[PDB]
Amino acid sequence: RKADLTGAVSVVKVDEIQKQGENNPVKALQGRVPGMNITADGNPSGSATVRIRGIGTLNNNDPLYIIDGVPTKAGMHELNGNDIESIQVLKDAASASIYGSRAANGVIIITTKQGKKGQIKINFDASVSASMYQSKMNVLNTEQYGRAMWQAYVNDGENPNGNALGYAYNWGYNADGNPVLYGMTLSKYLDSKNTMPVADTDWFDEITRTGVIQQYNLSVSNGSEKGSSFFSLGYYKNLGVIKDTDFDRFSARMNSDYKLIDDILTIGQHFTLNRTSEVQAPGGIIETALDIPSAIPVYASDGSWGGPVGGWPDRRNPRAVLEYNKDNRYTYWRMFGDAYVNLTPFKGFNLRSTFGLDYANKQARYFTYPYQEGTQTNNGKSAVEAKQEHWTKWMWNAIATYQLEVGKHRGDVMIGMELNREDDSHFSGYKEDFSILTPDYMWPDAGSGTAQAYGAGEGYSLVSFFGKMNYSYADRYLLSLTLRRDGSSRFGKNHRYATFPSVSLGWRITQENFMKELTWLDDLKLRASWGQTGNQEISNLARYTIYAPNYGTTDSFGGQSYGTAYDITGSNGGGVLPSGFKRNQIGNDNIKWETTTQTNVGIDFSLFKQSLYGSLEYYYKKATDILTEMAGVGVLGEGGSRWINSGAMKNQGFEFNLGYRNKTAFGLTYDLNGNISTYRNEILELPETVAANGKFGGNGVKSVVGHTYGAQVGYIADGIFKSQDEVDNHATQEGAAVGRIRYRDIDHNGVIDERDQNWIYDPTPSFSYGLNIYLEYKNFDLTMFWQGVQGVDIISDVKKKSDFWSASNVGFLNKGTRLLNAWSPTNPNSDIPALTRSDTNNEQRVSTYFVENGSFLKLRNIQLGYTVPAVISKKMRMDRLRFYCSAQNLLTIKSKNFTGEDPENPNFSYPIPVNITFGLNIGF
Amino acid sequence: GKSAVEAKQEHWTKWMWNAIATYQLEVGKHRGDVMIGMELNREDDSHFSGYKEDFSILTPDYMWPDAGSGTAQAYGAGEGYSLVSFFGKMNYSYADRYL
Amino acid sequence: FSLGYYKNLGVIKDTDFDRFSARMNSDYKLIDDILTIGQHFTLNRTSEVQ
Amino acid sequence: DDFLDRQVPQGIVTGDQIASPEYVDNLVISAYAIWATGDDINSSFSLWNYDVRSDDCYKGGSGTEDGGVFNALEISKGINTTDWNINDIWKRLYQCITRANTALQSLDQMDEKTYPLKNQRIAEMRFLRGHAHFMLKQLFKKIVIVNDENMEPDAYNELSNTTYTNDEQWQKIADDFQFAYDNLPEVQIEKGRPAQAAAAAYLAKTYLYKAYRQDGADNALTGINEEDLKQVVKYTDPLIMAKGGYGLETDYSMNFLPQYENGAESVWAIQYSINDGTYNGNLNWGMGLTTPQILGCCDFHKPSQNLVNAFKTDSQGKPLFSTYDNENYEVATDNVDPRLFHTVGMPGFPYKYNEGYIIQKNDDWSRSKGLYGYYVSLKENVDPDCDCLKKGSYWASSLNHIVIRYADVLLMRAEALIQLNDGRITDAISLINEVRSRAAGSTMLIFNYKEDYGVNFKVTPYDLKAYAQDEAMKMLKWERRVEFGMESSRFFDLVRWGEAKDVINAYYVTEASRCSIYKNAGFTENKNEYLPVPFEQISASNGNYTQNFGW
Ligand SMILES: OC[C@H]1O[C@@](CO)(OC[C@H]2O[C@@](CO)(OC[C@H]3O[C@@](CO)(OC[C@H]4O[C@@](CO[C@]5(CO)O[C@H](CO)[C@@H](O)[C@@H]5O)(OC[C@H]5O[C@@](CO)(OC[C@H]6O[C@](O)(CO)[C@@H](O)[C@@H]6O)[C@@H](O)[C@@H]5O)[C@@H](O)[C@@H]4O)[C@@H](O)[C@@H]3O)[C@@H](O)[C@@H]2O)[C@@H](O)[C@@H]1O
Ligand SMILES: OC[C@H]1O[C@@](CO)(OC[C@H]2O[C@@](CO)(OC[C@H]3O[C@@](CO)(OC[C@H]4O[C@](O)(CO)[C@@H](O)[C@@H]4O)[C@@H](O)[C@@H]3O)[C@@H](O)[C@@H]2O)[C@@H](O)[C@@H]1O
Ligand SMILES: [Mg+2]
Ligand SMILES: [Mg+2]
């Protein structure tokens, strides 16, 4: 039963959601909803990014979740997802407008479990899983690194023995004169102090482990003709594949409802309290592991952490970084409550008053230990940073609803007044100069150095007056009209309030009397909708010209702190310097709501007595007056960025969902749920400065207007040179040589320059599809979910560090294994450019070489279960006893054009492991 | 002319786990209750504060540690304790007269 | 299920104390008399100027 | 309905309150802080990153890829208008300009009687704005002259770099310096604030740069203006400098030592401080990359062998005008100017006058494994045991960056007198002799080298007699080269003199043997003497910004 019945609403089967055994319920439905993309890195937490109906605005695109009627935007990884009874995604503006003023990016409606009338249920779910690291990037070992360095040296024509890295090469020339390597030897110690012995270290294996996931849920549900209740407890723990990274969560939910008199005075509440403790991986840990050469030992001769010495590249020890980061644990208390009262003066009138609260409290204590890894050190700096953050949101809602059933005319009239009110704050203390260097001793009182205090606060409010009218004739013609008047504190008084209408029409064709002979066609419905929604998800301080006293106490990398503190006297400090103010942004009093107009046309069908069901949707979204933060013109200086309504986005999309469930003669019940979706995104208008800086695409070379959001312009790589004749015949370019990348001459001017660039990257897949298969046979249930993406291109940064030598900022870094298969006179059958120590050709430029085909098809979740026969369970007094074994991310298929691995995560983000899970469910 | 802000945060977290085994008997006029119990109590407290000076507008809206321009101080401490208990209780009643 | 609001302005000026409170208690009996699972929770928010 | 109106900005000041009279002084301090906190490692206000194009130094780091854009600038090949460093330095300099403009706008709306120091503060702010404009003009020939503090932001889109010609832009830059000279006090109790002497010296420098006319579409010298040279001579008079108590230091090294900050020769410097309530202190983060490998990382700003050979002198104490670069300098058999050991740290010698650190030709002092040599710049570096050096993810010190030195004033006066050729060459010769005499006596920390490393010092002043204009100009060029090495002014001087192309080509040819990075280097006659206008800025302001000639 859809909550709108006349809009683009997707109902997710919650039973299949819990099968995947994911902490985040949103991550579970990664590819089960058409036109809704979920991207998850693979960290122990269930944090993921959601994009509904593509990219719809130049602002925050997270959809508005609704739990028990209370809206929010925080991720669901911090809430217990095992007590959800229904999930509905409202991807249509007309249908989702009535649920809030933040519905521009879509609304996901989540309903929690409630006690079923007249019965009691208890469910205990246990789950133990092992997560294994699968996407192991192949990097050069010691011998391979030496061979690659020798190849680069001989290709450049330099002496390979001058590497000054302890490698001594015995080599010569063949009959054709091409250099050949006979053998290599290494010095025992990398430094003259004999403190860093040479070793063959697998850094990826050193920093990875086999994670353990535990999940225990216990829920009890109570129903009656007269009231109901529900109490759930949950514990989740996930150890990541990366060492010293973990995430655990305790959860307790209590829901209840009471009916007084006979039917009047229905008072209900839903509350949940969660406590999540997490240690996250340091930024660029995978990059650090990939960059550091395998010759560096984990431990030095004296037992301290190993590190680069002499001429080895400056990279920290990833194991040491993980060890020092294991104490950066943060605790997060989440609190989602709601209490509502419903009054019924007579049969058709309802008055609902609702109060919802969301309180979040985050406490963290970060430590900075002194480290000395060879030549890598922080000058013995030890510090503590105690940070506290508070978020407090509350919403009050009043709803008046009237229903009439006059003849064949059904009429629902609803009005509503809503207030939303959010306040955020944070403050932190910073201390230095510690002695014991242990988390027990590192407290700000125990410090003996410079101290810093940081602190800020913000907030906003929203007011909404909405109305909804639904008319039904003969249960065949449906009309819906909703109107919203929304105001926010982020806008000035003149442009505070805005009006948004939406209309929906629906015709149940099967109800018409002219096709009663079509017995096979069980149900057919055609619906259309045209709606407008408002977007105001911008910075709270958007219309003010901000001047802030930035003294410079905040840590900055590179010294570009832009602080306001100058030693005007010239005494080299020694006290409190005079300070001032700096401009952060220029105010704009003409900012108003961004208007997103959505037109949707859908056809729902069901054939063969509800056996073959499905839906087909086509949508057109047009966002105008987009509140974008334009940067300064360049001579406007600091604080030149300002918010302006100068945007325009278009999204044209198709979605198709199908489902076929049927039994078999010998007792097999098969259910197939297929889904496919495609969309095209375009930017029609954009501010000149925004298009110039290329923050939304174009790389600052060409304007992204008229092209897909995020599209990138680069050169075109027409293979590599294989002879001097090819270099001479090709158009002249700097650094052209044998074995170097050849770049196409777009304008045919005879010279390769910055004007020889074109659109090369389009981050829009041709189509994304999913398929769920459920088989039941003799108490055996098998679930198999496949997700595929076709026609998507990806920019690969790992390729830049695997197909080239000395293509990074610093040289002598560790590279990929496939680098060994580079072009050479001895090995002409290769497309990888020849190794070189100098990037004369400038191959780090954006080009089609780094663009790879990201199409993939992976088995997201497979599960085989066994249900104990009812007689044995009744003997053991359990109403339902089930066991199951599942595999998540077990298998994947990728295109041959993708040189790397894991097309879903082709970069240095958190890896996605393979989960092998065993679980049991008891229904006492 | 001293102006300053002091942002203080304190956390207290206590949890107790209890296990009780109770048996009751009603043999004739003899009533007997035997109870055993194992209890764990576990308390952790912490606090930290930041101190800033040299403010200009001198209003609560403007007084935040980031808006200060003077000497800053950081204070912080933590503590905790645990308790373990094994207890037993026996109640005997004769004729509902002798306890 | 109980909700409560209290506010007290002291006789001394600029001193006050307010408190919001929400309590939810429940108990459930399974089978016939075995497996009695219960809970009592209360959440309070007190804002005070002393 | 007060539901949406209770809430106000937290911890910030709105734009309508920044004009209050009690904040203006704060804003003034802001205009100075941007000169010490607004520079990154890759974009410093000393402009050493863009001085690698000259013959004084290479680019440090692990290799060419470490700052590929800067390597392309150094070799003058493969330079694209869509480079991040050019746009970054443009944006940072204009950020300084607009901070100064905001302070000026705040100052201009205040009563003179209530605020007696209004004129002095306005003069200081004009001086800072003119300094930023001058550095932009040096980097880019065509710049936008933002000299209107009372300009609305919406009008900033209507500005253009072709509104004024080159001469008009130079005059607009010099107007601020003229106002500052007319309004600044003779002596400043606070060393951070510029004095009248600094304004006069910088105005003379601006007029000297204006003298070498760059009329026409191309960047070729089209003549020397006599009026500009007369103005230079007028504004460089020794009476003005002596009125402010400025003069050459007794020892050269005191210009680059923490113990002698804000000295007599320090006409105006950026005040860098440590232990001042900041997270790491207002250190010179722009020079953080320049620290040697012994200090830990990045080994940038390595002086070239050409400069070391230039420091070599003959038996008569004069620089080798034609045979200096034929052979590498030898410590045992070649007389050397003492200024070399205060500028370049050669292997086998103490590092920053510290006997405990000896520079060696190994990986402990070179990051590129000999690709960029083993020489270490010393002017911006400090002793490792200074206690003025702090590790803030980049080794930076509190040593002041001296923008204007009295030796610079003397050399500009000598150059103006030589170019005038109005029977006053002997005064320029006397100034050069004074500079050389100051250099000769600068052996208070390197005196023992003669008895420790066999170093022969031989510097003598030129004889006072009649000199031809070309010979005197050559001697002035040599004195400038040997006096302001590592100080990031060689390329600008070459561009101003109009001989940048020939000198750069000769340097490339000579150093291609000892440095492979110059294998394919090449300098264009009318394209590589000025940084191109960033492509992002031109795209942002369509039909208003014109690219420099040759692009
Ligand atoms: O802005 C648009 C466009 O510009 C890009 C294009 O590259 O960068 C420019 C942008 O980046 C900055 C950062 O402030 O400059 C980077 C730029 O500077 C160069 C030289 O030109 O390198 C400078 C040196 O910095 C080092 C120093 O590394 C360490 C780490 O702290 O410092 C200490 C010494 O005190 C040493 O012990 C350490 O090695 O590296 C910093 C540089 O390294 C980067 C770049 O890949 O990543 C390396 C990180 O990987 C880790 O493993 C994970 O943390 C770490 O070990 C390491 O930090 C990046 O994080 C840092 O910027 C040293 O290696 C260099 O010699 C160039 O190499 C570099 O390109 C800005 O100045 C400038 O605006 C992009 O940002 C963007 O597309
Ligand atoms: O991130 C910018 C923006 O986020 C806000 C608004 O909630 O708060 C986020 C703060 O969390 C910070 C570090 O403290 O990073 C986020 C990490 O903290 C976690 C903890 O669960 O997330 C907190 C917060 O972000 C979501 O996860 C986003 O959906 C929400 O579910 C949750 O409420 C964790 O998920 C992240 O790793 C940092 O970004 C912010 O301080 C604002 O404070 C801030 O403006
Ligand atoms: Mg071309
Ligand atoms: Mg100083």
Q: Which neighbouring-strand residues pair with A386?
A: A365, A429
Interface check A548 vs B, CB under 8 A: yes
Q: Which residues of D are annotated as a binding site for Mg(2+)?
A: 52, 54, 261, 272, 398, 400, 518
Nearest to B76 by CA among A144, A668, A443: A443
Q: In terms of residues, how long is chain B? A: 99
Tell me the C-alpha distance between A262 and A265, whole Å. 8
Cα-only R_g, chain B: 28
Cα dihedral sign, A730-A735-A739-A742: negative
Give the H/E segment covering residue A428: strand A409-432
Which SS3 state, helix, strand or coil, does residue D32 take? Answer: helix
Distances, alpha carbon D19 to alpha carbons A19, D23, D137, in Å: 63, 7, 30
Taking the CA of D397 as reference, the closest ligand is: 4
User: How far is it, in rounded angstroms, from Cα D344 to Cα D303?
Assistant: 7
Structure-token match 């918010």, residue found: A643
Ligand 2 nearest-atom number relative to CA A45: 35
CA D108 to chain centre: 30
Q: Give the number of other Cβ atoms within 10 Å of residue A860's Cβ.
A: 23
**Ligand 1 near A376 CB (within 6 A):** yes
Q: Are A858 and A786 in contact (CB under 8 A)?
A: yes
CB contact under 8 A, D13 and B66: no
Q: What is the 3-state secondary structure (H, E, C) of A435-454?
A: CCCCCCCCCHHHCCCCCEEE
D431, D329 in Cβ contact below 8 A?
Answer: no
Whether residues A565 and D277 touch (CB distance < 8 A) is answered with yes
For residue A457, which of A490, A425, A485, A493 has the smallest C-alpha distance? Answer: A425
The residue whose C-alpha atom lies closest to atom 6 belonging to ligand 2 is A74
User: Which of B57, B58, B59, B63 to mutate: most D Cβ within 10 Å?
Assistant: B57
Using a CB-CB distance cutoff of 8 angstroms, which residues of chain A are in contact with residue C27? none
Task: State whether residue C34 sits within 8 Å of chain A by CB.
Answer: no
Helix (H) or strand (E) holding A760: strand A758-761
Measured between alpha carbons, how far is residue A434 from residues A430, B51, D69 in Å?
12, 20, 41
D41 lines ligand 1 (CB under 6 A): yes
CA of D42 to the centre of ligand 1 (A): 10
A269 lies within 8 A of chain C by CB: yes
For residue D157, the SS3 value is: helix
The conformational region for residue D267 under phi > 0 = left, psi -120 to 50 = alpha, else beta, is alpha
Hey, CA dihedral for A513, A518, A524, A526, is it positive or negative? Answer: negative
**B51, B56, B58, B69: best mutation site toward chain D, by most D Cβ within 10 Å?**
B56
Close Cβ partners of A821 (under 8 Å, ≥ 6 residues apart): A827, A830, A832
Reported structure resolution in angstroms:
2.9
From the list A367, A441, A361, C17, the residue with the least C-alpha distance to B11 is A361
Separation of A300 CA from ligand 1 center, angstroms? Answer: 27
Distance from CA of A487 to the nearest CA of C (A): 28
Task: State the first-to-last Cα distance of chain C, in angstroms, to the nearest integer.
Answer: 31
Looking at the CA of A810, which ligand is closest? 1
- Tokens (6 digits) for A790: 């076709």
Q: How far is CA D384 from CA A310, A370, A745, D363, in A?
A: 19, 19, 52, 18
Angle at CA of residue A251, ends A249 and A257, nearest 5°: 160
Rounded Cα–Cα distance for residues A242 and A289 (Å): 11
Strands B4-27 and A881-894: unpaired
B67 interaction partners in chain D (CB closer than 8 Å):
11-12
Could you give the C-alpha distances from A666 to A56, A778, A833, A869, in angstroms and in order? 49, 10, 60, 19
Closest CA to D60 of D284, D292, D271: D292
- Rg of chain D taking only CA atoms, in angstroms: 24
Across the interface, whether the CB atoms of A386 and B51 are under 8 A apart is answered: no
Residue whose tokens read 């954006």: A846
Strands A521-535 and A36-39: unpaired
Cβ burial of A254 (10 Å; 0-12, 13-18, 19+) is buried
Q: How many CB atoms lie within 10 A of CB A821?
A: 13
Taking the CA of residue A334 as reference, the ligand 2 atom at the shortest distance is: 33
Q: How many residues does chain C have?
A: 50
Q: Under a CB-based contact definition with an 8 Å cutoff, are residues A463 and A419 in contact? A: yes
For chain A, the C-alpha Rg in angstroms (whole number) is 31
Q: From the centroid of its chain, how far is CA A818?
A: 30
Q: Parallel, antiparallel, or unpaired for β A546-548 and A477-488?
A: unpaired
Residues of D in contact with B50 (CB under 8 A): none
Q: Which amino acid is at A70?
A: V
Residue by residue, what is the 3-state secondary structure of A519-559? CCEEEEEEEEEEEEEEECCCCCCCCCCEEECCCCCCCCCCC
d(CA B4, CA A171): 72
> Collapsing DSSP states into helix, strand and coil, what is residue A213?
strand
For B69, the closest chain D residue by CA position comes to D277
- How far apart are the C-alpha atoms of D440 and D433, rounded to whole Å? 10
Residues 57-76 of B with CB under 8 A from A: 64-76
Q: What is the least distance, in Å, from the CA of D549 to any CA of chain A?
A: 17
| Chain D residues touching B66 at Cβ < 8 A | 11
**Spatial distance between the Cα atoms of A332 and C25, rounded to a whole number of angstroms:** 25
Mutate to test the interface with B, among A329, A368, A443, A577 (most CBs of B within 10 A): A443
Q: Among candidates D243, D309, D253, D187, which has minimal Cα distance to D443?
A: D253
Contact A427 B65 (CB under 8 A): yes
Distance B61 CA to ligand 1 centre (A): 38
Annotated binding-site members of D: 52, 54, 261, 272, 398, 400, 518
Tell me whether residue D189 is exposed, middle or buried, using C-beta atoms within 10 angstroms of its C-beta: 0 to 12, 13 to 18, 19 or more.
exposed
Experimental method: cryo-EM
Distances (CA, A) of A359 to A233, A241, A389, A489: 19, 31, 11, 21
Ligand 2: residues with CB < 6 A are A 47, 74-75, 78, 332, 360, 362, 389, 391, 424
Touch between B and A (at least 3 CB pairs under 8 Å)? yes
Inform me whether the C-beta atom of residue B4 falls under 8 Å from chain A C-beta atoms.
Answer: no
Beta-carbon contacts of residue D23 (< 8 Å; ≥ 6 apart): A580, A581, B56, D13, D17, D106
- DSSP conformation class of D58: -
Enter the DSSP assignment of A700. Answer: T
Instruction: Give the helix ranges, DSSP H, for D6-161.
Output: 24-37, 68-75, 84-108, 118-139
- Provide the 8-state DSSP code for A875: H
Concatenated DSSP letters for D165-230?
Answer: -HHHHHHHHHHHHHHHHHHS-SS-SSTTS--HHHHHHHHHHHHHHHHB---SSS-----B-HHHHH
Q: How far apart are CA D123 and CA B3, in angstroms?
A: 33
Residues of A in contact with C33 (CB under 8 A): none
Which protein residue has the closest C-alpha to ligand 1 atom 27?
D298
Residue A693 Cβ inside 6 Å of ligand 1? The answer reads no
D497-519 burial, b for 16+ CB within 10 Å, e for fewer?
eeebbebbeebbebbeeebbbbe
Dist. CA A547 → ligand 2 center (Å): 25
Q: Which of A580, A660, A569, A583 is nearest to A614 (CA)?
A: A660
**D82 touches ligand 1 (CB under 6 Å):** no
Q: How many separate domains does chain D show?
A: 1
Q: Is A389 helix (H, G, I), strand (E, B) or coil?
A: strand
Q: D6 in contact with B at a CB cutoff of 8 Å?
A: no
Its domain, for residue D79, covers: 1-551
The β-bridge partners of A338 are A270, A356
